[PDB]
Amino acid sequence: AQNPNCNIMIFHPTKEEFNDFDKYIAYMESQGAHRAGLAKIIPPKEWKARETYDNISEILIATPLQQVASGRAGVFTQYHKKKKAMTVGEYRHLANSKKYQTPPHQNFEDLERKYWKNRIYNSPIYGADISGSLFDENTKQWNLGHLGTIQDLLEKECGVVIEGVNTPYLYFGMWKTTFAWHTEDMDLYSINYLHLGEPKTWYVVPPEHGQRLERLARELFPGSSRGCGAFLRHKVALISPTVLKENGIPFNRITQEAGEFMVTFPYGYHAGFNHGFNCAEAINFATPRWIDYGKMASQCSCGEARVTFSMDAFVRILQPERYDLWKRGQD
Ligand SMILES: O=C(O)CNC(=O)C(=O)O
Ligand SMILES: [Mg+2]
Ligand code: NI
Ligand SMILES: [Zn+2]
Numbered sequence: 001a002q003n004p005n006c007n008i009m010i011f012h013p014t015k016e017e018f019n020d021f022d023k024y025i026a027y028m029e030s031q032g033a034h035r036a037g038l039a040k041i042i043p044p045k046e047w048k049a050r051e052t053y054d055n056i057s058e059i060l061i062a063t064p065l066q067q068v069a070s071g072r073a074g075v076f077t078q079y080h081k082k083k084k085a086m087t088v089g090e091y092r093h094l095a096n097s098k099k100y101q102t103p104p105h106q107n108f109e110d111l112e113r114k115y116w117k118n119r120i121y122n123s124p125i126y127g128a129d130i131s132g133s134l135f136d137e138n139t140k141q142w143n144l145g146h147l148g149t150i151q152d153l154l155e156k157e158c159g160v161v162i163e164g165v166n167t168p169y170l171y172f173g174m175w176k177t178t179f180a181w182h183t184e185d186m187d188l189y190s191i192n193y194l195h196l197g198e199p200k201t202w203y204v205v206p207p208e209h210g211q212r213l214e215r216l217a218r219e220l221f222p223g224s225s226r227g228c229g230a231f232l233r234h235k236v237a238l239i240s241p242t243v244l245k246e247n248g249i250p251f252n253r254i255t256q257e258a259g260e261f262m263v264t265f266p267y268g269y270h271a272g273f274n275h276g277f278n279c280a281e282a283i284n285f286a287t288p289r290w291i292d293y294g295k296m297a298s299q300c301s302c303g304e305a306r307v308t309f310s311m312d313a314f315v316r317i318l319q320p321e322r323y324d325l326w327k328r329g330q331d
Contacts, residue, residue, distance in 0.1 A: 003032025006206035008039065008252045011329035015044040019142045022148070025263070025287060032160050034289075036252055037268025038204035041261040043142065048059075050136035053196045056279070057089030058249040059170070061127035064091065067178055074240035076120050078178060083125060088279075091127055095174035095277035102175040102198065102276040108255050112201060115273050116240045119139055119176050127172035134170065134195050134281055142261065144168045144193060144283045160317055164310030168283040173200070173274030180235045181217070181271040183210070184308055186314045187297040188284040189194070190264040192256070198220060198276030200256045203241060207267040209250045216247050238271060266293035276286040292317045299327035 009031065013024055024041075033039040065080040079111065086094070090226075094100060105111040133145035149166040175198075184190050194200055205213045214232065218225040221237055230232070244251050256262050258278070264270055266289070286294075295318045299305075307330070316323050 001032070002030070003035045006035040006037070006208070006250065006252070008036045008204065008254045009033040010040040010042065012042050013044060015046045015105060015141075018044050018047060021142060022287065028263070029289070033263075033304055034265040034268075035206055035208065036204060037206050037265050037269060038158060038202060038252070038254065039263045039265070040254060040256065041263065043259065043261065047139075047141060049139055049143075049193065049219065050134060050196060053134075053279075056134065057092070059088040059130075059132070061086055061088065061091055061172060062296050063196070065126045065128055066123050067176075068123045069238075071120065073117060073120055074180060074243040076238050077221070077224075077236045078180060078238065079236065080126075081123075088127070091125070091172055091174075092277050094125065101173050108199065108201065108275075111275060115201075116242065119178065120272070122176055124174050124176040124178070126174070126177040127170075130170040130172070131167055132170050133168050134279070142193075144191060144281050145175070146283055147191075147283060150188065150284060150286040153288070154291075154314070154317065155289055157291050158317070162313035162317060164313050166284065166310065168281050171280040171282065173197075173278045173280070175274065175276050177274045179270070179272050181232055181237050181239060181269055182235045183232070183267050183269055183297075184264065184284055185311050187267045187293040188286055188290060188317070189266060190282055190284050191264045192264075192280055192282040194256050194258045194260055195279045195281060196258050197256070197278030198274065200272055200274050200278065200280065201253065202256060202262065202270055202272040203244075203251055204264070205249065205251050205269040207265060210267050210269050212249050216244075216249055228300055228302040228304065230298040230300045231302075231304075232269070233298070233305040237306075260272050266290050267297075291318075299326050301325045303329045306330065
């Protein structure tokens with residue numbers, strides 16, 4: 001078995017290997033990359049996502065989210081308070097203000113220490129989940145707005161044509177902005193490209209050990225657990241590496257820098273934080289290997305998780321027994 005310790009693998013494809021996305025994902029899996037739940041892909045030196053980032057300041061962040069924490073430094077939840085709209089240029093200035101800017105630090109490990117020590121005492125503002133793309137239309141390789149759609153994959157694998165679309169999302173981050181422990185909708189893959197700015201630190205649990213994280217989360221968030229049998233679908237809970245280590249949960253960590261891709265694999269729980277002002281683009285995707293994970297994915301039916309239009313068909317076709325209850329949670 002390849003990669004039996006479930007380490008995060010880093011790939012350096014040549015420009016020739018960068019042509020065929022599906023083929024390269026299957027290659028990475030042949031080497032065991034999925035066992036970690038997360039992989040890094042450094043694009044060939046010849047590649048670029050677009051020519052410059054000089055003209056992005058007029059993009060609108062219609063609903064910036066202030067991420068307010070509750071709990072203790074290593075075990076907390078966050079809720080998202082909606083703020084007034086602002087442009088990317090306005091948000092970048094905000095991120096660089098004395099109130100929100102990255103503190104002085106020695107290296108990524110020092111910054112990671114400071115994040116876990118101090119996150120809960122501040123409420124950073126995240127421009128998340130903005131439909132759109134920063135890939136130039138002329139970028140032909142690994143252009144996250146030109147991937148094969150998950151609806152087309154389900155149709156190719158299973159023969160059923162379904163409604164729905166699959167488009168990317170932009171994320172504008174600042175110091176301490178935080179993504180809570182989660183897997184993707186329907187335990188899909190994700191791919192994330194850091195277009196510009198400061199790094200993003202990731203934590204990930206191997207898919208084979210995901211249920212260990214879930215059991216710890218039920219212990220640590222006992223009211224939330226009683227409220228919903230899949231409360232990590234709410235995307236609000238954080239657990240630090242120190243707490244994970246104290247409770248014997250297998251995980252790994254890695255820092256993504258600008259110009260790098262990350263791939264999350266089906267049922268790979270992940271969480272993380274931004275080091276300073278940045279912009280990322282991400283989208284879900286599927287492969288044939290995903291279908292079995294889609295069929296087994298947990299679902300929130302309590303009403304909290306509320307997701308896209310396109311997840312309807314996935315539930316309806318892959319999980320017909322669950323469909324009725326899940327749809328009630330959507331409506
Ligand atoms: O970058 C972020 O805030 C969150 N991204 C992801 O969870 C992802 O790409 O799957
Ligand atoms: Mg602009
Ligand atoms: Ni994710
Ligand atoms: Zn729920």
